[PDB]
Design a protein around this ligand. Structure first.
Ligand SMILES: Cc1noc(C)c1-c1ccc(-c2nc3cnccn3c2NC(C)(C)C)cc1
Length: 127
């Protein structure tokens, strides 16, 4: 009945850089998702203790959430856009793996995911 430590959002041993793609991921993609009415359950790590889901971190071994992604972007954690995109993908996939197809949280995820894909489609070329 304990949560794991949340994913790191900074690491002095991990190389980082700014790219126009990462800037787009923060200012366009993250910002757009963050303000969506269905965003709030994804704005921080899943609190399996409070939700009384004792099997959550037994099934989900690579947790990820938009709060973590937001901080990673703001804190200049990433080296490239692929790292950040993978984190988004992990967030959605986890939700679909743990929850049932009909569940409210899945329908909320699906709405955010559609939006994410619409924005990621126009990711700028690196320059
Ligand atoms: C994201 C995510 N990936 O897996 C699970 C499980 C969640 C999840 C599910 C549910 C919630 C939630 N948190 C509150 C807090 N207070 C009341 C309800 N809550 C609900 N359930 C809702 C409304 C989202 C169905 C949060 C995260």
């Amino acid at each position: 009945s304990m949560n794991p430590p949340p994913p790191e959002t900074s690491n002095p041993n991990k190389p980082k850089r700014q790219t126009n793609q990462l800037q787009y991921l923060l200012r366009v993609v993250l910002k757009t998702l963050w303000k969506h009415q269905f965003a709030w359950p994804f704005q921080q790590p899943v609190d399996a203790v409070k939700l009384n889901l004792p099997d959550y971190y037994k099934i989900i071994k690579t947790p990820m959430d938009m709060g973590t992604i937001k901080k990673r972007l703001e804190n200049n954690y990433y080296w490239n856009a692929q790292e950040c995109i993978q984190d988004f993908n992990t967030m959605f996939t986890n939700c679909y793996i743990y929850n049932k197809p009909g569940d409210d949280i899945v329908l909320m995820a699906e709405a955010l995911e559609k939006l994410f894909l619409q924005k990621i489609n126009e990711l700028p070329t690196e320059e």
